[PDB]
Write a protein that binds this ligand. Structure first.
Ligand code: BCL
Ligand code: BCL
Ligand code: BCL
Ligand code: BCL
Ligand code: BCL
Ligand SMILES: CC[C@H]1c2cc3[nH]c4c(c3C)C(=O)[C@H](C(=O)OC)c4c3nc(cc4[nH]c(cc(n2)[C@@H]1C)c(C(C)=O)c4C)[C@@H](C)[C@@H]3CCC(=O)OC/C=C(\C)CCC[C@H](C)CCC[C@H](C)CCCC(C)C
Ligand SMILES: CC(C)=CCC/C(C)=C/CC/C(C)=C/CC/C(C)=C/CC/C(C)=C/CC/C(C)=C/CC/C(C)=C/CC/C(C)=C/CC1=C(C)C(=O)c2ccccc2C1=O
Ligand SMILES: COC(C)(C)C/C=C/C(C)=C/C=C/C(C)=C/C=C/C(C)=C/C=C/C=C(C)/C=C/C=C(C)/C=C/C=C(C)/C=C/CC(C)(C)OC
Ligand SMILES: COC(C)(C)C/C=C/C(C)=C/C=C/C(C)=C/C=C/C(C)=C/C=C/C=C(C)/C=C/C=C(C)/C=C/C=C(C)/C=C/CC(C)(C)OC
Ligand SMILES: COC(C)(C)C/C=C/C(C)=C/C=C/C(C)=C/C=C/C(C)=C/C=C/C=C(C)/C=C/C=C(C)/C=C/C=C(C)/C=C/CC(C)(C)OC
Ligand SMILES: COC(C)(C)C/C=C/C(C)=C/C=C/C(C)=C/C=C/C(C)=C/C=C\C=C(C)\C=C\C=C(C)\C=C\C=C(C)\C=C\CC(C)(C)OC
Ligand SMILES: [Ca+2]
Ligand SMILES: [Ca+2]
Ligand SMILES: [Ca+2]
Ligand SMILES: [Ca+2]
Ligand SMILES: [Ca+2]
Ligand SMILES: [Fe+3]
Lengths: 319, 258, 60, 40, 280, 60, 60, 40, 60, 40, 60, 60, 40
């Protein structure tokens, strides 16, 4: 346990905290809290209780159907031979409906199960979003999490709702497969002229990167200032403290400007939530609005120019 | 992004739609980034930026209103805070130059040892009891089954010499954890609190190593008003004292290495 | 409802509100599911066969 | 738990009526279904 | 110009090299030894990067030489020289400029170091920033070295360094199958999943519903305990994050390094070791 | 109508507020999802048959 | 009836809340994991043999 | 656990009759299908 | 249970509850696991020979 | 632990027995199994 | 058996409950593992050969 | 017990509890790893040659 | 550590011995193996 506020050297335990009182109508928490010395050596040790109401139960049950369907077909292709199942797991996956069905409901064989397990996974998330909304207002909390989770969901549906349907073919939808879905994103790009030139795709990376960047700063800074109680952000947001009182000066002296203990968390939010925002878009545009982002770039004089040390002929025009 | 445009299409009709929202959001943020600190104090080096300006690109925002919980006051952001005090003299009449700590920098309360006057009250839990308290009050808290007990270990010091021995540790009701250590200085025989952040463990020799300040410095550590609860005011002024050591506990530290 | 007699005792050990929500939800999926698993196979009644093709008399 | 035999028993019938209500509402669903397009 | 609470922190000392000399503040920034250093690299490179836009692929009079930020590019020398300095024109710029990158990045960290040394804060930030720099030291030094050619580096072109990422990527076919690469990716995603979660919660407890007080850590814990059961902890997240962030970069560094020096075949194939296992 | 005399009590164990708005949504999606399913595949009342003129005299 | 002799003592170490709940789950999933896999199997009933293809007849 | 011998034996009994309730309703289930569509 | 007589001792260190429940699970999965595994390659009464005819004959 | 020698045998005996009920139950299962489709 | 004349001392340093539960799993896994690996290539009595070919005899 | 005279001292610095269990994990893993590396290449006794293709030859 | 010279010797003896028990077990298989397909 090296102390750079990395691992809690000495842990202590108190009676299982059954969460704070909820409002009327909200079922009582369930689950006997557990304690883990190891886990707790990372952060908190106590576990649960967990809430589970209508939306919750309706969700945990819903999406649990999709997962089954998927894992089922997977173990199905392997001819129910677990041996080869745990072998080709990565490869195994529930493929979408063939283009010879458009959007029509295909038979369980040719793409059916996918669609089904899809809607069950589509609503499973939409429903889960409400589940979170019910956990916010029940605690007088705001909906910053729902707003974000929403954004993510946006891009999630772009991969099936808004784009595929806008294309008129369930073929342009990601498959239920660890590896095969990697090929999806692998093919999509190839199909649309290289996402490197797709504007939104870049903007989105700036976030996948920025995101990682900030937390690398914040998560760190808070620790570096964890000495002066820099982890207790809440009472810091209310009445500024010494932690946040030097915590900024650092950044200020280093990069010139800075933000407040609260402020930053707002940047982080928009630097992360905006990630998928530029995600669903960059994909909502591809296939529909644009078809070849390479020529699209050069069309606007984007694509860089390189000398010609290597070039190939074209047997088509020739022959 | 080109100065002149000869091509028009939907893809690009949405891109700019973003940058506008972006150029706007970045401002929204900036505004918030000024709810603590500004306005500035001097003019050592005339605000630098592509476009100077009086106080940044975005005008200061409107004071937000924070309703603390029960039995609490109210906070506003931003707020007009009265000027602080500097117990240091300018190393040079030239702007920007640092300020040398007067007297013993270990307690000059400047820079590393310098801490703002936090509310001379105490943080509480959801119900209303002082959040951070000593185990001598936390009748429920016990050392994790297995993890070695701190209560009884001898708190060593920077120079190595022993400064005292732990008599108790302060746990946190709100967030189960150990935040402070009720250390019993040998010199003054007083009882000062020790922050986790500076508290290091050596379960082998039953000690709580500290590179912050020397064993002798543990003597005049910002005392606490009520030994049954730590005040936010003092709490922040506490662990700040140790910080000084991080840069004053030895002339060599502040001194260059090369 | 004959066996209902002895079955009444269950309420004393399990929270009634649970078996209700767990089931009101359990049926939700099952229903949305069946019409689905069925409409996708045995008979896609909506637009697979009868009635009068919305494509034939439709598209034309 | 958290209830006695009295309040419990009552719940057993009241909901039971609505329960079979389903077995019935869905039995009419099938019986009229099997009638329409026989399956198997 | 200082913040409402700056003056009482601008202490003298805590310098690594020749501090007293440059020990001062220029506006909201700090200089010191490393302060001047980085600058000596900034303009010496930033301008060279411009000189490249000026000059161009072949010449300043060429039709290739452009100023479009998108088309701008500063590619390294051929793989012929290997570990040799190529003509400033034919790869020289990149080579030199890059040497300025390390001088800027590294110094920038070192500068942060003593900067923290003054605030008596933790050296987390810099140590964290190290990885980023380290990752760079891999995409230009480590990898190229074990490849025997400074030409293996990536072009310094806003969009130009994307192709270098496409080729080297496909150079191993479906670059999506890279173990380290995948792993790393997960982290980048987890991280973003963390931010979208952390930042959100804070704002959701310090700015609750209308006519509501500022929630406490008492809620935070319960909140995530009612949606998924467990709550990592306050600083825990600030730990977890820092972890993900670094881990994301670390595993990535490995990701590209292994690609080439430690593997020439196609990544998709590497996974075969799992297949050719005497179990199936 | 038989069990009708004994179901009003359903309001002593299930809070109204929550059961109302919850379903208000329950249906919102459901129906918003029906037109959905029917429109994509079953039949396309807008583009399928009539009025044939809009796009027959439109696409031309 | 044989084993039912001393098997009553079981509930004395195994809570009924446990069994009741898990049992439902197992028997639920397990069951669905039968019509399911078996369905996908030859003896499918929805669209395998009879009702003999009427879709083909009625549709067109 | 959480109980004594008394409450224990009572549960087990009713709990059984409820289990044979299944086996019978399911065995009769299988059999009805067994007659219709013969597996094996 | 012949030599199993002395084994009585096992209970003090092999916790009852745990041992029973846990073990009860191991079989649950295995039971299916096996049936699945055998059902895979050996022989598949579900899709191999007769009395299955309705599947193939009934289809075409 | 948490238990003593006296009930150590009691839990021991009740559980051991049942275990053999399944061993006989399933051995029989594998019996009709071999009868139907012989394997190896 | 002799060599074990002093082997008793083992239950003094090692934790019985642990060494037990551990092996409880190790052999549990070692076992399912082997059958798995052997049944893979060596002799796959399932789909490998006779006694009968319910599939090659019955299928065709 | 030849070297048991001079090397006894080893246990005073080496925590008996750690090295014992630690080494245990090793060898068993080394063993399972070896069989693995050997059975795979040198000769896959399970699948490789004799006794004989009882399976492939015996079946078909 | 956590002991002395005397007690340390005791463990060294029981441990060491039973160890050969293994090498003895290993070699015999290495050799019963070398009997079969003498590798190389
Ligand atoms: C990591 C693997 C590849 C790589 C793959 C990608 C991919 C894939 C993408 C980028 C993208 C970007 N990359 Mg790159 N990139 C690499 C290494 C670098 C290095 C480097 C020093 O090593 C730099 C400076 C950049 C810089 C950049 C930015 C121009 C652009 C925005 C990213 C972002 O938002 O991050 C988060 C951080 C911030 C927003 C804050 C700071 C970043 C600023 C905005 C960028 C300034 C760069 C500037 C033009 C350099 C000259 C400065 C002179 C003083 C003028 N890349 C390596 C070789 N890079 C994205 C893009 O759109 O490219 C066109 C994109 O999609
Ligand atoms: C598959 C071949 C047939 C067909 C055969 C069947 C069969 C067979 C059945 C249905 C059933 C249904 N069908 Mg149909 N159906 C077909 C085509 C359709 C089409 C279509 C567009 O083509 C549609 C829109 C529907 C629509 C529907 C739904 C109305 C209904 C789903 C009920 C349900 O499970 O709720 C899920 C359940 C619940 C939410 C809870 C359970 C209800 C309880 C008893 C009441 C709640 C009590 C509560 C605690 C008290 C408070 C009340 C309020 C919450 C305040 N069918 C085709 C033609 N359909 C089912 C039905 O409606 O039976 C009556 C049914 O059994
Ligand atoms: C065909 C193309 C291949 C491919 C080919 C490659 C190749 C080739 C490489 C990667 C690399 C990476 N790829 Mg890949 N990759 C593909 C598809 C993907 C997908 C996807 C969803 O499809 C994802 C998420 C990723 C993700 C990633 C990252 C894990 C990794 C970049 C790591 C990093 O953190 O560098 C962290 C950052 C840096 C090195 C830059 C250092 C930052 C410096 C110190 C700061 C700059 C400051 C600046 C000067 C100031 C700006 C301010 C201005 C003054 C205003 N790849 C496809 C399949 N990928 C790279 C990698 O593995 O790197 C290890 C790599 O080399
Ligand atoms: C492949 C060739 C044959 C075939 C050959 C076999 C063989 C051979 C066997 C089975 C067995 C089983 N088969 Mg079959 N089976 C076939 C086709 C099928 C089909 C089908 C749809 O086609 C189905 C659904 C099944 C279904 C089943 C299961 C009913 C049964 C597995 C029980 C179990 O896992 O207990 C798991 C165990 C437990 C949960 C707990 C342990 C049991 C203890 C003794 C009782 C519990 C005590 C407890 C502590 C007290 C509290 C009580 C409650 C838990 C609350 N078979 C084909 C035709 N089948 C097995 C069987 O019948 O065993 C009797 C078996 O050996
Ligand atoms: C390759 C050609 C041969 C072959 C050649 C060899 C050779 C050569 C060797 C083996 C060995 C082994 N083979 Mg072989 N083997 C073949 C085919 C097989 C097949 C098969 C399915 O086909 C199997 C399952 C095995 C299985 C095995 C293992 C039994 C054994 C490795 C044990 C081990 O690693 O312990 C791991 C170790 C430990 C857990 C602990 C260390 C032992 C100590 C001394 C005892 C523990 C002390 C403890 C502190 C006291 C507490 C007691 C309890 C733990 C509580 N072989 C083919 C036919 N096999 C090895 C062997 O058996 O040597 C004797 C060996 O050297
Ligand atoms: C695991 C580490 C994560 C991380 C952490 C991190 N980054 C950091 C820090 C930390 C802790 C800082 O403290 C520092 C910072 O912002 O301090 C205020 C920083 C920083 N991270 C930055 C960028 C950055 N980080 C990235 C990634 C990450 N940063 C990781 C997720 C990425 C990418 C590619 O995803 C980028 C782009 C900077 C904003 C900043 C460091 C700024 C700095 O030190 O700049 C020094 C130099 C100059 C200003 C002048 C450069 C001119 C040279 C003479 C020429 C060099 C040429 C260059 C190589 C060409 C680039 C061309 C491209 C456009 C193709
Ligand atoms: C074509 C054309 C017409 C051109 C015109 C060109 C013209 C006019 C030019 C003149 C203008 C010029 C020259 C401008 C130069 C401006 C320059 C050089 C600025 C240099 C500064 C610089 C490189 C800054 C980099 C900043 C970056 C990229 C940061 C990335 C991370 C990020 C999103 C930061 C924003 C939010 C902040 C400040 C986070 C830091 C931060 C973190 C991370 C905490 O954890 C924390 C905890 C508690 C309190 C505060 C903080 C805190 O501030
Ligand atoms: C003082 O207060 C007093 C005590 C008086 C109480 C007042 C009480 C009141 C008002 C109480 C009201 C209670 C009510 C109204 C309760 C109503 C309850 C109802 C209607 C319950 C209905 C239950 C229905 C059940 C449990 C149905 C179960 C169905 C099952 C298990 C179906 C299984 C389906 C399967 C396995 C389907 C599989 C599908 C395939 C085969 C495809 O899977 C592969
Ligand atoms: C009165 O007493 C009271 C009541 C008070 C208290 C307590 C009573 C107790 C505790 C009674 C306990 C009874 C017990 C504990 C009986 C236990 C017997 C046990 C646990 C026996 C376990 C033996 C396990 C052994 C010997 C395992 C050996 C495994 C080996 C050698 C494995 C080798 C594996 C290899 C080489 C695998 C290779 C993998 C492949 C083949 C894939 O490599 C190619
Ligand atoms: C007042 O106090 C009172 C009277 C209440 C005390 C109460 C006492 C009570 C309630 C006592 C009750 C005791 C009971 C009921 C005990 C029950 C014991 C049971 C049911 C044991 C069941 C055991 C089932 C077993 C052991 C199955 C074992 C299967 C094994 C170990 C299979 C191994 C399979 C392998 C390795 C398979 C490999 C498959 C391949 C290798 C082919 O996969 C590739
Ligand atoms: C047998 O299984 C057991 C019981 C052992 C359980 C084990 C299960 C396991 C191991 C499951 C493993 C699952 C895995 C590995 C899944 C991996 C999934 C991956 C990698 C997915 C990747 C991407 C998926 C995407 C992008 C999915 C998008 C889905 C969409 C957009 C669905 C949209 C659905 C819509 C719009 C439905 C609309 C309703 C209709 C069709 C009616 O509207 C007309
Ligand atoms: Ca595919
Ligand atoms: Ca049929
Ligand atoms: Ca058959
Ligand atoms: Ca066979
Ligand atoms: Ca050889
Ligand atoms: Fe934070």
């Amino acid at each position: 346990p090296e102390y750079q506020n990395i691992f809690t050297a000495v842990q202590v335990r108190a009676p299982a905290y059954p969460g704070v009182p909820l409002p009327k109508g909200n079922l009582p928490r369930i689950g006997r809290p557990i304690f883990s010395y190891w886990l707790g050596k990372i952060g908190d040790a106590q576990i649960g209780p967990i809430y589970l109401g209508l939306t919750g139960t309706l969700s945990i049950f819903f999406g649990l159907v999709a997962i089954s369907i998927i894992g089922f077909n997977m173990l199905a292709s392997v001819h129910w031979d677990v041996f080869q199942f745990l072998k080709h797991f990565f490869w195994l996956g529930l493929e979408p409906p063939p283009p010879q069905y458009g959007l029509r409901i295909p038979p369980l064989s040719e793409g059916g199960w996918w669609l089904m397990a899809g809607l069950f996974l589509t609503l499973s998330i939409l429903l889960w979003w409400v589940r979170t909304y019910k956990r916010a207002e029940a605690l007088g909390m705001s909906q910053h999490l729902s707003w974000a989770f929403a954004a993510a969901i946006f891009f999630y549906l772009v991969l099936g709702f808004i784009r595929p349907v806008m294309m008129g073919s369930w073929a342009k939808a990601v498959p239920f497969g660890i590896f095969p879905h990697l090929d999806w994103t692998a093919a999509f790009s190839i199909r649309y002229g290289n996402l490197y030139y797709n504007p939104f795709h870049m903007l989105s990376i700036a976030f996948l990167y920025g995101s990682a960047l900030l937390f690398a700063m914040h998560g760190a800074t808070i620790l570096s200032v964890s000495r002066f109680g820099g982890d207790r952000e809440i009472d810091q947001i209310t009445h500024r403290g010494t932690a946040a009182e030097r915590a900024a000066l650092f950044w200020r002296w280093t990069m010139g400007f800075n933000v407040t203990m609260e402020s930053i968390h707002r940047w982080a939010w928009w630097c992360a939530v905006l990630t998928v925002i530029t995600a669903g878009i960059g994909i909502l545009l591809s296939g529909t609005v644009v078809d070849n982002w390479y020529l699209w770039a050069v069309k606007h004089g984007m694509a860089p120019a390189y000398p010609e040390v290597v070039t190939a002929v074209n047997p088509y025009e020739t022959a | 992004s080109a100065g002149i445009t000869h091509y028009i299409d939907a893809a690009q009709i949405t891109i700019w739609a973003f940058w506008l929202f972006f150029f706007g959001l970045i401002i929204y943020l900036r505004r918030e980034d000024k709810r603590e600190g500004y306005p500035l104090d001097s003019d050592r080096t005339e605000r630098s930026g592509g476009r100077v300006k009086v106080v940044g690109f975005p005008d200061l925002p409107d004071p937000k209103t924070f309703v603390l919980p029960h039995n609490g006051g109210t906070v506003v952001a931003p707020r007009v805070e009265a000027p602080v005090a500097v117990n240091a003299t300018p190393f040079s009449p030239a702007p920007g130059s640092p300020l040398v700590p007067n007297g013993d920098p270990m307690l000059s309360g400047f820079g590393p040892a310098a801490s703002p006057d936090r509310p001379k009250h105490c943080d509480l839990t959801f119900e209303g009891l002082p959040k951070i308290v000593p185990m001598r009050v936390a009748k429920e808290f016990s050392i994790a089954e297995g993890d070695p007990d701190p209560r009884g270990m001898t708190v060593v010091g920077l120079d190595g010499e022993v400064a005292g021995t732990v008599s108790d540790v302060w746990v946190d009701r709100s967030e189960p954890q150990i935040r402070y250590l009720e250390v019993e200085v040998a010199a003054n025989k007083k009882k000062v609190l020790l922050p986790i952040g500076f508290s290091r463990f050596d379960k082998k020799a039953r000690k709580v190593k500290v590179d912050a300040i020397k064993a002798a410095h543990f003597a005049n550590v910002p005392t606490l008003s009520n030994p049954d609860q730590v005040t936010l005011y003092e709490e922040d002024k506490v662990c700040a004292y140790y910080a000084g050591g991080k840069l004053y506990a030895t002339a060599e530290r502040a001194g260059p290495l090369l | 409802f004959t066996m209902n007699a002895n079955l009444y005792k269950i309420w004393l050990i399990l929270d009634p509100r649970r078996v209700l929500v767990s089931i009101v939800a359990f049926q939700i999926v099952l229903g949305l599911l069946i019409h689905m698993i069925v409409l996708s196979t045995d008979l896609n009644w909506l637009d697979d066969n009868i009635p009068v093709s919305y494509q034939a008399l439709g598209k034309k | 738990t958290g209830l006695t035999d009295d309040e419990a028993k009552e719940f057993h019938a009241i909901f039971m009526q609505s329960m079979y209500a389903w077995f019935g509402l869905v039995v009419i669903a099938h019986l009229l279904a099997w009638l329409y397009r026989p399956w198997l | 110009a200082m913040l409402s609470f700056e003056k009482k922190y601008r202490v003298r000392g805590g310098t690594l090299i020749g501090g007293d000399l440059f020990d001062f503040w220029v506006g909201p920034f700090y200089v010191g030894f490393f302060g001047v250093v980085g600058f000596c690299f900034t303009l010496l490179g930033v301008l060279l990067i411009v000189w490249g836009a000026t000059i161009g692929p072949t010449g300043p009079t060429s039709d290739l030489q452009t100023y479009n930020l998108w088309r701008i590019s500063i590619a390294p020398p051929d793989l012929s020289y290997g570990l040799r300095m190529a003509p400033l024109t034919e790869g020289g710029l990149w080579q030199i400029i890059t040497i300025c990158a390390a001088g800027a990045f590294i110094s920038w960290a070192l500068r942060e170091v003593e900067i923290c040394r003054k605030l008596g804060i933790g050296f987390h930030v810099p140590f964290a920033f190290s990885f980023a720099i380290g990752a760079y030291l891999v995409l230009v030094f480590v990898r190229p070295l074990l490849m025997g050619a400074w030409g293996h580096g990536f072009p310094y072109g806003i969009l130009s360094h994307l192709d270098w990422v496409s080729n080297v990527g496909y150079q191993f076919l479906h670059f999506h199958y890279n173990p380290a690469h995948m792993l790393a990716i997960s982290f980048f995603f987890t991280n973003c999943l963390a931010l979208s979660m952390h930042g959100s919660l804070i704002l959701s407890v310090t700015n609750p519903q209308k006519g509501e007080p500022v929630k406490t850590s008492e809620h935070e814990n319960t909140f995530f305990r009612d949606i998924v059961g467990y709550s990592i902890g306050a600083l825990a997240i600030h730990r977890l994050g820092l972890f993900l962030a670094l881990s994301a970069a670390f595993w990535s560094a490995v990701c590209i390094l292994i690609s080439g020096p430690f593997w020439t075949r196609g990544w998709p194939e590497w996974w075969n070791w799992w297949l050719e296992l005497p179990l199936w």
